[PDB]
């Protein structure tokens, strides 16, 4: 099973972004935001 964290590496988003995402999303770029949302479902884990 994959993890939302692993995805960040693939999209080179940021360890802080996905980390704070569950706390207060405000560091993810609009473009990277849409890509993550889609990539989040693929792994089955959206949180």
From Swiss-Prot:
Residues 2-47 form the HTH lacI-type domain. Residues 4-23 bind DNA. Signal peptide: none annotated. It comes from the Bacteria. This protein negatively controls the transcription initiation of genes such as deoCABD, udp, and cdd encoding catabolizing enzymes and nupC, nupG, and tsx encoding transporting and pore-forming proteins. Binds cytidine and adenosine as effectors. This is HTH-type transcriptional repressor CytR. It comes from Escherichia coli (strain K12).
């Amino acid at each position: 099973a994959a993890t939302m964290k692993d995805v960040a590496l693939k999209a080179k988003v940021s360890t802080a972004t996905v980390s704070r995402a569950l706390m207060n999303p405000d560091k993810v770029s609009q473009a990277t935001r849409n890509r993550v949302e889609k990539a989040a479902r693929e792994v089955g884990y959206l949180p």
